[PDB]
Design a protein around this ligand. Structure first.
Ligand SMILES: Nc1ncnc2c1ncn2[C@@H]1O[C@H](CSCC[C@H](N)C(=O)O)[C@@H](O)[C@H]1O
Ligand SMILES: Nc1ncnc2c1ncn2[C@@H]1O[C@H](CSCC[C@H](N)C(=O)O)[C@@H](O)[C@H]1O
Ligand SMILES: Nc1ncnc2c1ncn2[C@@H]1O[C@H](CSCC[C@H](N)C(=O)O)[C@@H](O)[C@H]1O
Ligand SMILES: Nc1ncnc2c1ncn2[C@@H]1O[C@H](CSCC[C@H](N)C(=O)O)[C@@H](O)[C@H]1O
Ligand SMILES: Nc1ncnc2c1ncn2[C@@H]1O[C@H](CSCC[C@H](N)C(=O)O)[C@@H](O)[C@H]1O
Ligand SMILES: Nc1ncnc2c1ncn2[C@@H]1O[C@H](CSCC[C@H](N)C(=O)O)[C@@H](O)[C@H]1O
Lengths: 282, 281, 282, 281, 281, 282
């Protein structure tokens, strides 16, 4: 949709906040203690940035553990909604996977190829720019598909049909996602990020219809709540310190801070769930 | 500047929220009991817009009370940052004043003029598409200048210099504004609305250096804090009610809700003051 | 020349620094004690701005005194190199003069008409945009011409010929200007402002050739030196306080500060002279 | 950004001052006795350019001494902010290094390549027109990275993160830069050259957070202060010598003289430090 | 407090420097041409003491001019921090005023009284050994209060509160003092003389909160800077002239010279202002 | 004299400024480059303190070098005017000397015994509290005497007679001292510190009378000038940072700063000399 233009235009802010390096993640970070680190020695934007980065990697490491990526994500896999390729390179390098990276933000694909060349995995990571519900996917059967915080953009009934045609029997669909637990329980997240979160039931119903079984359903809501404290704290540090900010840039950072507070309030209100689902194709 | 274009762009989203009147207002509302009305069983967008418009009108009635608009605001006045003309029309109609309405949003100028005719005061209300800190003084001396929530956009020293030359001696400068009470006290407000809020002392110093005497200072922070609850409710009523909203306007509305939530929290955090000021030349 | 484009493009900085109001001056200020005021209660940019403005008006008041503007500048006069009209309105209002305001910066003429309307002298102040050495000047004989800090842009032999045709006998040419006293003694001023300052002899030679006599020659170098301290101090205050400055705006202010220091050093090196000349047409 | 365009624009005024070589350098000179040569009876522009170029070359010789470029700077290195390639060529020729020269001025990239061929090291020197804080890591691990007067343009935390991924363990990061020694100590330098200078501690903190160890810190403020006297003299020699200078370029030269005068004063005011740093991964 | 004892201790070293008069003054001198007299071929301690005493007297004559002591300082006044009574006697004799002289140095009170008799105004000059911020109001309303170089020792808010109750409406408060013009601008002065100097704004704020209006503000920094040269010269003339000085008093004199040298440097550094202020109740 | 009471009472300030540890020096520091170090990373009082301490040790190391302490100061020696024992322990430990430490400040002797016990040299360092010109010195002939910045307190004719009786033939008198080169050229130093500096001629005349020859005369004025910059800078840092200072303590620090500036000005005025003399007994 317009979401590809919305993801295009914030390329600059993502590299500012979640860069640099070759692996830039754009998803919430995982704090296995449900507590944000205390930042004392160093309260500059770069301190929160590196802490956000490290715990965003912690999210991937945690997922590969509970999903047993050693055998389930080491083969030929789809990285649906790849962002800037942080996840894509993570599977390619940590588990040797051959990755097809999918995005509807064209500005992003060349960045992912750059970063893959960079780490030397350009022969095992490929991008393609299309909608993930209409994608023609040459590349034979894939052993798995991973969606880190992108399935909220998808039509789930139709998306799971798509994956049923391109995933071999017994292949996995691994989803990290914001879900509702009550109705409207993720509205702040939904309206601000142009997503349409549903319940875990909705995902399971749509996946069952296309021939997938739910084999794992993990609640990481409490372990990802600290991400909003760090995300907020970073935004405050930039506003507080950098005096080269134009009035326009300063207002976007302000709007980002205002949103991070309302998102963090929602996260703990009990109406949403940060989940890790894994489906197996029947 | 980019602000004048920023006001141009939000003309439609702002007639939706605060229209249609012939008076559309773009300032916080004044709730004299310092609490929003409990909204009954009608919690639709129009129920809240009507309440927002009501207390927006009340803010001007209250300003007119404490300023004694009978004598001070009933002559040849500048409406500096007229928005969509709601304040301009107010002074023309309720106090028989002749009003020159200044803005840097050129799209808003026709709207103020069209509404001036439909009220039959088009012969008492002209517009000036210019910067407030470069005001044409041809147009003779003015009796007073009123700035309802616009002066956070101004270079106060320079603006008061301009006012010192266009305003007769004893002329009043009537200001409603968000001021700081401490450093960084209005940062959400400042960074979201593209303003540079300053303290009351800052304003009095700049006015003095241009020959102006601060003669009145009222704190109305408590009475305007409920505006954020009604403004937040209206936004929720829209996201909740109409499922024929495009994803793009649904996301803009969402961002406004997060903003209103951050803005109202800062309104009560202590660092900010919604104030009413009057200077005399 | 290109000087009109150079004067056009700094319209923004002049209003920032020497505005607002209706009378914006762009010339050095006059401090009759040869001492800059001590700024203590208020060291914000607006304090220095108002002090610069007030002493720039002091320059005009001082000039009208030593030039006896009551009879010499109350008639029909040429304001050559009018800037933004500060001088022009000053003669029009203080002494009732009918002013023809001349500039080679077209962006500036509409600003001067605006300010003249503003003060109600639009029937007694007119602009025309041309080079001051090729100007066709309808408007009969003029009783005087005033040039506040503009004659450094002119060919003096040719300019004085021009004034000899349009000034009645016994009319005055009033010049405030930077002059050299030694060779190269105004080079910092000259190269930075695109002027060509000469000596007082050079001016007198060129004016004698076209039929003018030098009747007054005043040295205001010491009374205008404090202007550089205030001009510098303002520039520092803006840089020090305003945190909305872009890197580009901050570098121009820095470059302005660097120039104000070198100009202030030149001013006192003994090589230049801030002069007030008055010539009478023979 | 606007900086990369700002470097594009001054290509001609900078080949005039520091060319023609095949090595053109755009960093201060190093005067080991901390004083400029007394210039004899030849005080022409070329006399000063030759002296400027001499000590610019000496700065790289001195950096190569204290860094031991024999082993640390003789492999596959990044030349981050290569200017017109003078430093790049230096490492290729004097230390038999293979050099990838990074800039954000696209006009400068052909000039660096052309000069790499004319020296016969075009097979040891490639260019990368990109931002330094988004460096292509395809191109294998590098031995070291050198930044002569470019890092004031960088986001140091982010830049060191990028370096942590492109540089082998034990790889060196060699920096010559203007640092602050106190707040606002390099403001003339910063506001004129579009940099954000920071202290040595700032640099070590950002390097640490990316796994880098500060292993060397040399103060060369005294030895580089005369550069401003030679740079100022050159400019004066040009304004003084050639009367076939257009008013526009005569005014640009004049502004550079006022700048050099303000820059050299700040160099001795205490608030700034011209330093040489080396980090190890 | 310890200050009142600190004034007690320097009674002899201060009669030596500024005596014997019947008027001994302990404030800087006022040099109307802003330069010390060139001292001829007599450069003895008494030559300089005479010059110091001369311009100390002139400071009070000048204060009396700008304050119009004819009407404002010729009634029932407080001399707050009277020192050794030189200012007290001045107002009694030159302006026919009745003076209540306040100090916290109990040793100084007899000296002020003895000198009041020897001038024949002992019936117009009484003393009050107390703290200035706890003044006995029994003694009826006063016409004015004058504080020559004593108010740096006061809690200004509290002091002005006390003044608001002892001074009739329209009563004047006349102050000569070292003020700051910027933070830390009078630190040598403050730390050596045990004062807490504040800005002129600080003083006006505290006076306002007690119902006082600042009506006059004169800067006399230039005219009092030579005092430090004469005060330094006097000290040198003493160390140089008399070889029957004990090592202990020779070291005290030496320390005073280093102090005067540091004090006079700070007087011209910009951070300080010797000012004359008048408030009206 | 009263000088012992003056040295007693500033025990507190010396430990604050030149402590802690076991070796506290009270003499100027030696900067072999004639340049004070640039303090940038750390401008707290402790940075200047440690730099002052290190260069005060540098003074002793420099003296032992030019005096060849390996054989001239390793034997049984007098440390006249020992301060808090910094010099005394330095000879005892670095060259194995047996030290008799002399002072007229009794508060100081127990501090020196404490510090000697501390370093384990209590059997080779002894204090005695008396005037250095009337001292009965049991302890046989001494091989040398050292006076670091104390001889300014002594009657030189009489003091050298004293040393002639207690020093074996060929023994050394090693003096570090402020000397005048012009008359009054050390007055600031003299009056502030209760010393009576004389010229090098005066010292040589008095030492010749008691049977000593001047064999070495070194000018260290330029190498010790940076000490005043550091001493001043420390005093400023304490005043600037510590907010627990009483008004009385703050005024003494101020008075100290005022003195350090006038002492530093004197040091470079050309009227005084920081000298290292060595005399040999005939
Ligand atoms: N309709 C659609 N089809 C394909 N990709 C989409 C899409 N809508 C959104 N996306 C992509 O989904 C991603 C959401 S955030 C990126 C997530 C990334 N895997 C990470 O965690 O690092 C973006 O890359 C966005 O471009
Ligand atoms: N620089 C500028 N010059 C003139 N008007 C400006 C301005 N910057 C902002 N404004 C105007 O000031 C107004 C701010 S909000 C509108 C306030 C209006 N009185 C009301 O209460 O409805 C807008 O009209 C905006 O366009
Ligand atoms: N060749 C030329 N012909 C006419 N005007 C010129 C000119 N060159 C420069 N000027 C004008 O001379 C002025 C110099 S500064 C403006 C001076 C003004 N009178 C004041 O003091 O307020 C500018 O207005 C500039 O546009
Ligand atoms: N963001 C950025 N990314 C990459 N290079 C940059 C940059 N910003 C500035 N630079 C480059 O850094 C250099 C700064 S000055 C040139 C330094 C060069 N080593 C020499 O001494 O000659 C310029 O080449 C400039 O274009
Ligand atoms: N707390 C206090 N209460 C009353 N007097 C005080 C005081 N602290 C200081 N003073 C006095 O104020 C005077 C300061 S200096 C003496 C000033 C005197 N008017 C003159 O010019 O000679 C001293 O007399 C001192 O004792
Ligand atoms: N008349 C006297 N007799 C003996 N010692 C004296 C003296 N007068 C001063 N002194 C001592 O001389 C010393 C001067 S400063 C201390 C110097 C010490 N050697 C050091 O550099 O670390 C003090 O210890 C002081 O007490």
């Amino acid at each position: 949709r317009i979401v590809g233009q919305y993801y295009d235009d914030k390329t600059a802010k993502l590299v500012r906040k979640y860069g640099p390096g070759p692996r830039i993640h754009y998803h919430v970070g995982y704090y296995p203690s449900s507590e944000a680190p205390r930042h004392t020695r160093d309260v500059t934007p770069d301190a929160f940035r590196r802490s956000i980065r490290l715990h965003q990697e912690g999210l991937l490491r945690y997922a590969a553990k509970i999903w047993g990526a050693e055998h389930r994500l080491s083969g030929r896999i789809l990285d649906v909604g790849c962002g800037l390729g942080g996840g894509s390179l993570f599977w390619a390098q940590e588990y040797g996977a051959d990755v097809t990276a999918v995005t509807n933000a064209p500005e992003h694909a060349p960045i992912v190829e750059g970063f893959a060349r960079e780490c030397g995995v350009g022969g095992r990571v490929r991008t393609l720019v299309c909608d993930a519900m209409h994608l023609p996917l040459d590349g034979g059967p894939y052993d798995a598909a991973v969606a880190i915080e992108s399935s909220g953009y998808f039509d789930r009934p139709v998306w799971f049909e798509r994956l049923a045609h391109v995933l071999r029997p017994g292949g996995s669909v691994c989803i990290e996602e914001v879900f509702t637990t009550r109705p409207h329980g993720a509205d702040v997240w939904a309206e601000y990020f142009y997503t349409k979160p549903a319940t875990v039931l909705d995902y399971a119903e749509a996946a069952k219809a296309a021939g997938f079984e739910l084999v794992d359903d993990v609640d990481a809501t409490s372990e990802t709540l600290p991400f909003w404290e760090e995300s907020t704290a970073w935004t405050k540090a930039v506003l507080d310190s950098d005096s080269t900010l134009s009035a326009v840039d300063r207002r976007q950072l302000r709007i980002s801070l205002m949103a991070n507070q309302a998102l963090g309030a929602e996260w703990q209100a009990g109406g949403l769930r940060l989940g890790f689902l894994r489906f197996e194709r029947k």
